[PDB]
Amino acid sequence: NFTNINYYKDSYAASATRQDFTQDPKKFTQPVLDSIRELSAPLN
Amino acid sequence: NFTNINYYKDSYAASATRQDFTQDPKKFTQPVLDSIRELSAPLN
Amino acid sequence: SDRVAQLTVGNSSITTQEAANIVLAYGEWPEYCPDTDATAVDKPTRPDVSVNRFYTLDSKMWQENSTGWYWKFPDVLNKTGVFGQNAQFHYLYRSGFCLHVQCNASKFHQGALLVAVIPEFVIAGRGSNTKPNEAPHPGFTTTFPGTTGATFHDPYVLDSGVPLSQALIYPHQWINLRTNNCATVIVPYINAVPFDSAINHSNFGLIVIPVSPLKYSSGATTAIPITITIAPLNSEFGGLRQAVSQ
Amino acid sequence: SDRVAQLTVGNSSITTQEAANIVLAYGEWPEYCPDTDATAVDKPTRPDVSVNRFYTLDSKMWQENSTGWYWKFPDVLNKTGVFGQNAQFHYLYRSGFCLHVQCNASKFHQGALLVAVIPEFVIAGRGSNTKPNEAPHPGFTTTFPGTTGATFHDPYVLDSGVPLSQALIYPHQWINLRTNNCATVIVPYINAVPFDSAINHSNFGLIVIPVSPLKYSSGATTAIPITITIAPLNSEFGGLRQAVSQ
Amino acid sequence: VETILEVNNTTEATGLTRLLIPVSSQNKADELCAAFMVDPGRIGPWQSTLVGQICRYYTQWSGSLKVTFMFTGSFMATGKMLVAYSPPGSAQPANRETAMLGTHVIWDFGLQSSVSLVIPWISNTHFRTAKTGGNYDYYTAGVVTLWYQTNYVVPPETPGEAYIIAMGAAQDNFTLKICKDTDEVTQQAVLQ
Amino acid sequence: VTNAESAANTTPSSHRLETGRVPALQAAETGATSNATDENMIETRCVVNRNGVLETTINHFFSRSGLVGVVNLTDTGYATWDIDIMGFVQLRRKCEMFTYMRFNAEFTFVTTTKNGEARPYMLQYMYVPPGAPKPTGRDAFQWQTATNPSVFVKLTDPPAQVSVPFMSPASAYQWFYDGYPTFGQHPETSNTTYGLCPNNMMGTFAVRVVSREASQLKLQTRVYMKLKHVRAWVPRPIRSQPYLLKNFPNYDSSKITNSARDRSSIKQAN
Amino acid sequence: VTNAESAANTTPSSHRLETGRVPALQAAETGATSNATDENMIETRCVVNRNGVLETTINHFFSRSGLVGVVNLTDTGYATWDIDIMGFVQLRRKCEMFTYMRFNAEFTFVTTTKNGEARPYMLQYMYVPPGAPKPTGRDAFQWQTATNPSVFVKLTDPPAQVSVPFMSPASAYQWFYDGYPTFGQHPETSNTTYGLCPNNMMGTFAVRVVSREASQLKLQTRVYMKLKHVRAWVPRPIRSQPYLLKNFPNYDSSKITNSARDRSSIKQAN
Ligand SMILES: CCCCCCCCCCCCC/C=C/[C@H](O)[C@H](N)CO
Ligand SMILES: CCCCCCCCCCCCC/C=C/[C@H](O)[C@H](N)CO
């Protein structure tokens, strides 16, 4: 499926480049310093 | 990025050829004969 | 081993006997500016002792029918200490912060607070006027309150047209008067430019809205204060010139 | 290769086309305080860019019948720049200096100046009174002149009972209006204690006494100024607290 | 390449005494000689140089600048100057103690009759739009001032009035982005 | 950092009868989202999930065209439009979901007539960067476009389309700016410059009909912007109040619209 | 000769306290630019510069189209245009920045009507080299173009575009010629031939409407030239005075426009 092909020297005129599935939910859901387990009481 | 491709025998009908970064500022900024250092007095 | 804590930064220390955690904002530590992201040529200064310490502001009374308070973070400290002198003589500023909001109460008081940081917390002007030149705008002592803070008029919309209910997408904590008494956030330097002035642009802002208002019985302590202590972690300045107040 | 020179310190540079040398005071360089000689426990601050640069004072007219001028060295810079803020907020101070006194004149003027540094240059009170409580003492704007300097009343005794003839045991130079126009001294930190305040104690003092007074013919330039530029080499401060002017 | 600035572009300067900074002898100390803005895409002295006509073709510039002062005077006339660059903030300084708080240089008229003050790249953003005025005072570069450091001393039988020729150029890290058209050329009808 | 498609599958679980292991009791006072999952609460089965999450990235969410501005040309002879995409509340809210954004663009120009038609005339679209002189007439010298990028297209042509790079002096576009652009004495009554980021002023977009006399038509060109190669930072809540101004987040003091519709009681789901 | 992109980065520097090493004292009397750099004057830090200088070559600076001439056709039946690009002050000043230039060209032909429209007629563009006979009518025999290059294009077509090589008898195009084309007794009063380089006369450009009777329209064709494969030599200062003539650098004796706007005093930056 040739779609990435460009026709100019400027790289900002191309299509939607490689789709990387990067996902780091640990920075919005668990930002606390001390790593808490999920099978124990949060505050001992 | 195929752009250099021509379609005639005449070479003056092509696109903007290879971009060479040639730069010699030493002929407009320091044209004197005796090479002067930059950490000494010009006229000893 | 999780509720007691001590936070020594500089010649100041903070002791507490019941906290919950220390939320790290966006899971990142306050760092120094690398040589890759830097753009200014002049060498920056780093006091590293006199500016990285806990500055304590005045106390805010927590009345039963309170609405909330908000402070700008590089602007609360411009006349206090060596940090204000450094952020008045220089022109560029980059640092992270280290928050701590204390509100102690007995085991017979109830209530809660939502403390959070809001990057680029822009104050909206209140009033129905869809005309560019006739619209109302907030004053200078409302956008930049200073060290005495500023109260909310409509805490339900954060005075910016944004719901408070979904204001938990920000680095935040709670002060539940039955579990903890202190909320602390370690926020890094969040900006679109590597360096920025500490007099025209306020990076972010703390908000403390009292949800589930304070309640108690007769005979208990009525005066319930609220104290916050800031620490400018990893401060560095650049562009030394004449001192400008504002 | 000996008369032209350039002295780049910080974001300031000094160019000259005819000097004689650069006397190094007591053959030593301004260093940082080692861990052996240090006594304070708190970590010192080091701006290293904003305070180590050439500060230029106002110009002094050189009249024909002039007597001389003198300045205290950690006291001329307490309201100017980031160095004054650092030496007002902090309590301890240690640095060396880098002197430069310029006085240019044509090839038809004659005269000379003696520029020197005097460690612990104590100003004496003039007057014959051998009674402890009735004796005269110099004012505060005479012991610590500030950035506007102070003139001598008797330059022959350096206003301290000490002959000027044998004042060549001090790091010094001459400004002979036929040979050079600039005298520069690089003085290290000379004191009996490792650190000292920069508001109560003035380490040393420059003196510029015009020996062989200025002479010229009619039609020449009459206004002959005298400009001095200081550079606080290797400045470090300690003991951050509230700012005190004096 | 160095190129003479029009620092004397004030009124009452006739045709060619607009390139000269007059120097003479003073009576009060700490006097001031001249002052001009740094912005090369701005109306003023930089409009007459070669870097301020090339940075007017482009709507963005970056890097350090360079100002070279040459003293055209008698051989027997000595003196010293304090040329000082000041990053943005307040207005032009009023005293020499305020001016010496920036990045100055102490230049003395000797055998070498030319000094060069490099203007460092002290900015927040990577680039600066070469169009100041209005809401574009966020891209100002500062003020260069030249002060009567000590005095202009002259012997008898010698003129007590000289001139300094200011020149300006770019540096090694100078660069430009996004071409445009200058505002100089005006044309009503075709050139027949 | 984990990189995977589909969706996290579940695992088989049994009942737990023991003390000290409590996955359900969380503590929201720590500012952390609860981490209790399906398997630990209830007895579950094993499933292999194949429900692709490719359509939920911030690069498929923004890579959709959308009206940014409309330009009415009467034929003064010309018409201008200061480029600012915060004028229509459909693409403004998705961009204001985030604080900082870095992206390329792709504008599409759709020009129609008063009643709606396409007469075979010629149009010139010219982009005026900040600092370039705006045209003062329909036959001025600014239209010579010796350096400004211009597009010559007819009404009977397909809609024009160009690609625009990241043209900001900062490292990203910020929509919310908590500060002033300049120094000085700021007033208490009318702060007409608070929250005005100078890194977003991109210039002026001008349009004229290429002719010599005056063409008797009232046109209307719509600018459709599409985002691509977009990166986003520092998410923030989505606005619930109706918009009033264009460059300011002003809302209405009275008649604040609640973020949830009303029901009869709190013990009645429906 | 050094070849590199980006920009020269800076290096860390410390303070210098010594005699004999003076990087600041230059000497402009030698006709050389000063070589003092950042590191030697002030204490600096280390930075890695990435600010690309690709857009500052003389091949990206000139490779931009631009109006060179306009040809009014009344329909005499035909219209001619002597090829000389020094008629509009926008592309004339960039080319007069240099003394010698060697380049290829690319002309674009944009033809409109009186009020501005595109009627489906036919146009013939014919290039007449120096020596070829110019056409004397709209139905003459010169239009048979048995050897001259011609373009047949309609008004409803896209604008025509051809490529033109370096067609000069010398090795480069010179804009300034300090001499006379011929020998003989040159006059003192009216030197109407001084500064006239014969190596730049390229011929005549003619245009007609291909028909038999007379078409009742007043057209106007604009020639947009773009330079490419351009080499430049011997740079020279850019002109500050307003242009008066087309082939001559004449200016105005009185009311000479200063190259810098006036201010109040010399001790007031603003
Ligand atoms: C005539 C054809 C080319 C037209 C060029 C127009 C595009 C130039 C402007 C770039 C737009 C960048 C995207 C929006 C930028 C800022 O976020 C807006 N000012 C938002 O206020
Ligand atoms: C009808 C289609 C072909 C049209 C051919 C026209 C191009 C032929 C002329 C070549 C132009 C070369 C560029 C300009 C040359 C000289 O510099 C000018 N005379 C400047 O005065």
Side-chain angles (χ1 to χ4, degrees), chain A residues 1-17 19-36 38-44, chain B residues 1-17 19-36 38-44, chain C, chain D, chain E, chain F, chain G:
Chain A
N1 312 10
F2 303 130
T3 2
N4 40 328
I5 337 267
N6 203 5
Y7 298 103
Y8 327 94
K9 339 271 178 170
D10 312 308
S11 42
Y12 64 86
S15 285
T17 177
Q19 47 204 49
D20 62 278
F21 299 97
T22 294
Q23 212 205 152
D24 192 37
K26 198 64 72 73
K27 92 189 98 187
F28 300 103
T29 56
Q30 312 264 320
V32 302
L33 283 176
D34 311 278
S35 306
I36 65 175
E38 103 106 339
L39 229 62
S40 51
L43 338 133
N44 61 355
Chain B
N1 312 10
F2 303 130
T3 2
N4 40 328
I5 337 267
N6 203 5
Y7 298 103
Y8 327 94
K9 339 271 178 170
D10 312 308
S11 42
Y12 64 86
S15 285
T17 177
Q19 47 204 49
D20 62 278
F21 299 97
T22 294
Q23 212 205 152
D24 192 37
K26 198 64 72 73
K27 92 189 98 187
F28 300 103
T29 56
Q30 312 264 320
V32 302
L33 283 176
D34 311 278
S35 306
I36 65 175
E38 103 106 339
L39 229 62
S40 51
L43 338 133
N44 61 355
Chain C
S1 178
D2 196 291
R3 297 177 70 81
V4 309
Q6 183 180 2
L7 295 173
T8 305
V9 190
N11 54 1
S12 48
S13 183
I14 286 238
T15 283
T16 179
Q17 287 177 357
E18 62 155 12
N21 226 325
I22 297 169
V23 47
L24 184 75
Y26 298 118
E28 213 165 281
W29 288 93
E31 73 182 32
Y32 276 121
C33 176
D35 298 307
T36 305
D37 304 358
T39 175
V41 58
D42 52 73
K43 187 184 281 179
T45 190
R46 296 174 183 90
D48 253 328
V49 192
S50 34
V51 299
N52 310 339
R53 62 178 299 277
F54 283 103
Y55 295 103
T56 302
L57 302 178
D58 49 57
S59 288
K60 293 312 235 159
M61 281 305 124
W62 183 11
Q63 319 261 268
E64 273 194 330
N65 54 26
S66 245
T67 53
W69 308 270
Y70 63 92
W71 298 263
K72 272 9 151 88
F73 278 135
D75 143 73
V76 277
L77 309 172
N78 287 322
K79 280 82 176 176
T80 81
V82 167
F83 183 83
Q85 302 300 112
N86 277 315
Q88 283 181 356
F89 278 95
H90 294 88
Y91 172 66
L92 297 174
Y93 164 68
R94 167 162 180 165
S95 92
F97 286 92
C98 184
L99 251 263
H100 199 87
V101 185
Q102 318 109 18
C103 191
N104 63 79
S106 60
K107 295 177 173 67
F108 291 89
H109 292 82
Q110 77 187 8
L113 289 86
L114 174 61
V115 344
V117 305
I118 304 174
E120 305 294 333
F121 176 57
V122 179
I123 294 297
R126 305 183 297 117
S128 81
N129 205 316
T130 71
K131 217 63 62 194
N133 43 287
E134 321 167 30
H137 291 92
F140 181 69
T141 72
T142 294
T143 60
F144 287 169
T147 184
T148 174
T151 59
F152 283 104
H153 296 289
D154 311 278
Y156 180 64
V157 294
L158 290 178
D159 272 19
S160 33
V162 156
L164 182 139
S165 66
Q166 52 185 351
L168 306 185
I169 190 81
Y170 289 147
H172 71 301
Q173 261 195 2
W174 295 84
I175 300 171
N176 206 358
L177 289 186
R178 62 172 291 151
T179 317
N180 46 336
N181 32 61
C182 34
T184 136
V185 185
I186 303 194
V187 25
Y189 181 71
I190 302 167
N191 200 0
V193 291
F195 272 74
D196 204 9
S197 60
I199 289 168
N200 286 322
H201 183 201
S202 88
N203 292 319
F204 62 102
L206 210 85
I207 51 101
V208 297
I209 288 97
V211 195
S212 46
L214 183 74
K215 265 193 71 43
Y216 45 85
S217 291
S218 315
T221 298
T222 302
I224 298 266
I226 292 169
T227 296
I228 82 152
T229 76
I230 322 98
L233 291 177
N234 283 323
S235 314
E236 62 183 1
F237 299 89
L240 176 66
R241 80 283 194 275
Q242 53 175 349
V244 303
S245 159
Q246 68 96 30
Chain D
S1 178
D2 196 291
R3 297 177 70 81
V4 309
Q6 183 180 2
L7 295 173
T8 305
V9 190
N11 54 1
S12 48
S13 183
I14 286 238
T15 283
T16 179
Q17 287 177 357
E18 62 155 12
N21 226 325
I22 297 169
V23 47
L24 184 75
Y26 298 118
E28 213 165 281
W29 288 93
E31 72 182 32
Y32 276 121
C33 176
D35 298 307
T36 305
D37 304 358
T39 175
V41 58
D42 52 73
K43 187 184 281 179
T45 190
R46 296 174 183 90
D48 253 328
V49 192
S50 34
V51 299
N52 310 339
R53 62 178 299 277
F54 283 103
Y55 295 103
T56 302
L57 302 178
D58 49 57
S59 288
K60 293 312 235 159
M61 281 305 124
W62 183 11
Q63 319 261 268
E64 273 194 330
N65 54 26
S66 245
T67 53
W69 308 270
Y70 63 92
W71 298 263
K72 272 9 151 88
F73 278 135
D75 143 73
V76 277
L77 309 172
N78 287 322
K79 280 82 176 176
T80 81
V82 167
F83 183 83
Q85 302 300 112
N86 277 315
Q88 283 181 356
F89 278 95
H90 294 88
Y91 172 66
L92 297 174
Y93 164 68
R94 167 162 180 165
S95 92
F97 286 92
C98 184
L99 251 263
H100 199 87
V101 185
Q102 318 108 18
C103 191
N104 63 79
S106 60
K107 295 177 173 67
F108 291 89
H109 292 82
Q110 77 187 8
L113 289 86
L114 174 61
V115 344
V117 305
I118 304 174
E120 305 294 333
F121 176 57
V122 179
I123 294 297
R126 305 183 297 117
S128 81
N129 205 316
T130 71
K131 217 63 62 194
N133 43 287
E134 321 167 30
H137 291 92
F140 181 69
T141 72
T142 294
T143 60
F144 287 169
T147 184
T148 174
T151 59
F152 283 104
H153 296 289
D154 311 278
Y156 180 64
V157 294
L158 290 178
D159 272 19
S160 33
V162 156
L164 182 139
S165 66
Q166 52 185 351
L168 306 185
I169 190 81
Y170 289 147
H172 71 301
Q173 261 195 2
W174 295 84
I175 300 171
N176 206 358
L177 289 186
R178 62 172 291 151
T179 317
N180 46 336
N181 32 61
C182 34
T184 136
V185 185
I186 303 194
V187 25
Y189 181 71
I190 302 167
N191 200 0
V193 291
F195 272 74
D196 204 9
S197 60
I199 289 168
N200 286 322
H201 183 201
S202 88
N203 292 319
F204 63 102
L206 210 85
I207 51 101
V208 297
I209 288 97
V211 195
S212 46
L214 183 74
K215 265 193 71 43
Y216 45 85
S217 291
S218 315
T221 298
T222 302
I224 298 266
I226 292 169
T227 296
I228 82 152
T229 76
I230 322 98
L233 291 177
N234 283 323
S235 314
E236 62 183 1
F237 299 89
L240 176 66
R241 80 283 194 275
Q242 53 175 349
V244 303
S245 159
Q246 68 96 30
Chain E
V1 288
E2 301 304 293
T3 291
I4 302 169
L5 268 66
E6 261 203 40
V7 193
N8 200 358
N9 59 356
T10 87
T11 320
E12 284 314 309
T14 70
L16 197 65
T17 55
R18 300 172 68 95
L19 308 175
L20 303 170
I21 311 166
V23 193
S24 34
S25 315
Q26 302 297 114
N27 313 126
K28 324 181 209 63
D30 309 84
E31 290 265 20
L32 161 66
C33 213
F36 58 93
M37 297 297 294
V38 173
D39 305 337
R42 195 209 251 310
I43 48 167
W46 289 92
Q47 195 169 359
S48 88
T49 177
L50 188 61
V51 58
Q53 296 290 324
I54 293 232
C55 83
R56 203 175 294 267
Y57 268 116
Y58 296 80
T59 175
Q60 240 145 73
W61 65 277
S62 171
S64 315
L65 291 174
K66 177 165 66 182
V67 192
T68 317
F69 295 94
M70 187 180 79
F71 181 70
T72 78
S74 162
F75 177 73
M76 294 288 174
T78 76
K80 291 180 186 290
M81 306 299 282
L82 183 140
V83 51
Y85 166 66
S86 279
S90 87
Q92 185 204 344
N95 264 265
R96 200 187 73 195
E97 306 240 39
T98 305
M100 69 94 208
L101 284 174
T103 174
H104 55 96
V105 176
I106 301 264
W107 158 48
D108 64 326
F109 318 145
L111 205 160
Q112 312 297 328
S113 87
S114 162
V115 83
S116 87
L117 170 71
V118 165
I119 295 171
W121 180 246
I122 299 169
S123 168
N124 44 7
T125 75
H126 276 270
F127 279 84
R128 279 175 175 162
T129 280
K131 189 258 181 184
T132 43
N135 264 178
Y136 290 95
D137 292 338
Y138 180 80
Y139 301 107
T140 190
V143 192
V144 172
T145 67
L146 170 89
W147 302 84
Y148 268 117
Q149 167 75 36
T150 53
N151 203 4
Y152 173 80
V153 180
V154 79
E157 312 266 20
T158 305
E161 171 76 39
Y163 296 106
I164 297 173
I165 291 173
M167 291 172 284
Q171 204 63 251
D172 284 87
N173 47 3
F174 192 80
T175 175
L176 293 153
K177 239 190 42 196
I178 313 174
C179 312
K180 98 209 153 29
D181 271 308
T182 72
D183 350 24
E184 273 87 6
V185 274
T186 314
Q187 186 182 4
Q188 292 332 289
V190 71
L191 300 178
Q192 60 90 26
Chain F
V1 184
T2 79
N3 51 76
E5 353 154 323
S6 313
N9 358 298
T10 86
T11 73
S13 87
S14 178
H15 65 231
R16 63 176 66 246
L17 296 170
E18 60 253 9
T19 43
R21 316 280 153 220
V22 52
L25 289 172
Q26 301 294 321
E29 303 96 29
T30 80
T33 302
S34 87
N35 47 5
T37 177
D38 307 88
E39 295 90 319
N40 293 114
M41 307 277 283
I42 62 172
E43 299 201 35
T44 44
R45 64 172 294 167
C46 79
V47 307
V48 299
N49 245 343
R50 352 201 217 137
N51 308 349
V53 294
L54 187 43
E55 202 159 21
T56 77
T57 57
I58 66 166
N59 206 3
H60 289 288
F61 177 70
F62 282 100
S63 279
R64 293 172 185 271
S65 165
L67 183 96
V68 149
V70 187
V71 182
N72 288 312
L73 187 141
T74 191
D75 187 8
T76 317
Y78 65 99
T80 80
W81 172 63
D82 213 85
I83 293 135
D84 138 274
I85 72 165
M86 304 311 181
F88 288 89
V89 305
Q90 268 230 183
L91 196 69
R92 173 170 177 177
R93 189 162 174 263
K94 288 165 64 184
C95 300
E96 286 185 351
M97 188 191 292
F98 291 130
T99 305
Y100 309 104
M101 287 180 72
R102 180 185 179 95
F103 54 86
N104 300 322
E106 183 175 357
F107 297 76
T108 304
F109 299 135
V110 175
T111 315
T112 49
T113 310
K114 179 132 95 15
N115 43 57
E117 182 149 58
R119 293 178 181 175
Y121 287 20
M122 180 144 267
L123 287 171
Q124 179 175 1
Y125 302 126
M126 187 177 72
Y127 169 60
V128 178
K134 293 148 183 168
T136 76
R138 67 182 299 158
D139 40 51
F141 88 92
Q142 286 96 10
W143 297 109
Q144 301 186 6
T145 187
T147 42
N148 290 321
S150 314
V151 177
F152 290 93
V153 76
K154 292 182 175 65
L155 289 176
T156 68
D157 273 7
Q161 197 177 13
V162 295
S163 199
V164 179
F166 179 76
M167 308 187 28
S168 193
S171 279
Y173 297 112
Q174 50 178 352
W175 319 120
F176 299 92
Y177 181 74
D178 194 351
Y180 295 92
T182 44
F183 290 92
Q185 263 302 311
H186 297 289
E188 201 76 28
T189 76
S190 87
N191 275 319
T192 43
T193 45
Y194 172 67
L196 250 71
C197 187
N199 303 120
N200 298 114
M201 302 147 58
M202 290 292 106
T204 287
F205 175 79
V207 50
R208 72 147 175 177
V209 181
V210 193
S211 76
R212 187 181 65 192
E213 77 166 359
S215 51
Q216 314 300 129
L217 38 54
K218 305 191 41 172
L219 297 173
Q220 187 181 6
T221 161
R222 290 172 175 85
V223 178
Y224 279 93
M225 184 187 184
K226 121 103 105 317
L227 282 71
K228 66 183 179 182
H229 301 93
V230 45
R231 301 175 68 184
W233 292 276
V234 189
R236 70 170 54 239
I238 307 109
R239 187 181 176 99
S240 58
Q241 295 296 112
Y243 290 93
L244 298 183
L245 289 192
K246 166 162 130 292
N247 289 317
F248 299 102
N250 286 113
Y251 66 95
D252 198 352
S253 317
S254 45
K255 76 172 152 153
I256 286 174
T257 43
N258 296 312
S259 50
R261 302 277 77 79
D262 294 18
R263 62 182 179 179
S264 279
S265 189
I266 192 190
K267 323 158 141 31
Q268 265 284 310
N270 275 267
Chain G
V1 184
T2 79
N3 51 76
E5 353 154 323
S6 313
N9 358 298
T10 86
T11 73
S13 87
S14 178
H15 65 231
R16 63 176 66 246
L17 296 170
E18 60 253 9
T19 43
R21 316 280 153 220
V22 52
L25 289 172
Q26 301 294 321
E29 303 96 29
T30 80
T33 302
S34 87
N35 47 5
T37 177
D38 307 88
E39 295 90 319
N40 293 114
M41 307 277 283
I42 62 172
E43 299 201 35
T44 44
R45 64 172 294 167
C46 79
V47 307
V48 299
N49 245 343
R50 352 201 217 137
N51 308 349
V53 294
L54 187 43
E55 202 159 21
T56 77
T57 57
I58 66 166
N59 206 3
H60 289 288
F61 177 70
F62 282 100
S63 279
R64 293 172 185 271
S65 165
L67 183 96
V68 149
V70 187
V71 182
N72 288 312
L73 187 141
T74 191
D75 187 8
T76 317
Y78 65 99
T80 80
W81 172 63
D82 213 85
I83 293 135
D84 138 274
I85 72 165
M86 304 311 181
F88 288 89
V89 305
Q90 268 230 183
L91 196 69
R92 173 170 177 177
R93 189 162 174 263
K94 288 165 64 184
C95 300
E96 286 185 351
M97 188 191 292
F98 291 130
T99 305
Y100 309 104
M101 287 180 72
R102 180 185 179 95
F103 54 86
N104 300 322
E106 183 175 357
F107 297 76
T108 304
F109 299 135
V110 175
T111 315
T112 49
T113 310
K114 179 132 95 15
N115 43 57
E117 182 149 58
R119 293 178 181 175
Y121 287 20
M122 180 144 267
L123 287 171
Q124 179 175 1
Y125 302 126
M126 187 177 72
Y127 169 60
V128 178
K134 293 148 183 168
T136 76
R138 67 182 299 158
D139 40 52
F141 88 92
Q142 286 96 10
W143 297 109
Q144 301 186 6
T145 187
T147 42
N148 290 321
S150 314
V151 177
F152 290 93
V153 76
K154 292 182 175 65
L155 289 176
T156 68
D157 273 7
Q161 197 177 13
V162 295
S163 199
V164 179
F166 179 76
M167 308 187 28
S168 193
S171 279
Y173 297 112
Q174 50 178 352
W175 319 120
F176 299 92
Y177 181 74
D178 194 351
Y180 295 92
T182 44
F183 290 92
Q185 263 302 311
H186 297 289
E188 201 76 28
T189 76
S190 87
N191 275 319
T192 43
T193 45
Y194 172 67
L196 250 71
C197 187
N199 303 120
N200 297 114
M201 302 147 58
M202 290 292 106
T204 287
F205 175 79
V207 50
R208 72 147 175 177
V209 181
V210 193
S211 76
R212 187 181 65 192
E213 77 166 359
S215 51
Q216 314 300 129
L217 38 55
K218 305 191 41 172
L219 297 173
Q220 187 181 6
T221 161
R222 290 172 175 85
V223 178
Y224 279 93
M225 184 187 184
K226 121 103 105 317
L227 282 71
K228 66 183 179 182
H229 301 93
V230 45
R231 301 175 68 184
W233 292 276
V234 189
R236 70 170 54 239
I238 307 109
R239 187 181 176 99
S240 58
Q241 295 296 112
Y243 290 93
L244 298 183
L245 289 193
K246 166 162 130 292
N247 289 317
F248 299 102
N250 286 113
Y251 65 95
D252 198 351
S253 317
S254 45
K255 76 172 152 153
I256 286 174
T257 43
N258 296 312
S259 50
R261 302 277 77 79
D262 294 18
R263 62 182 179 179
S264 279
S265 189
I266 192 190
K267 323 158 141 31
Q268 265 284 310
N270 274 267

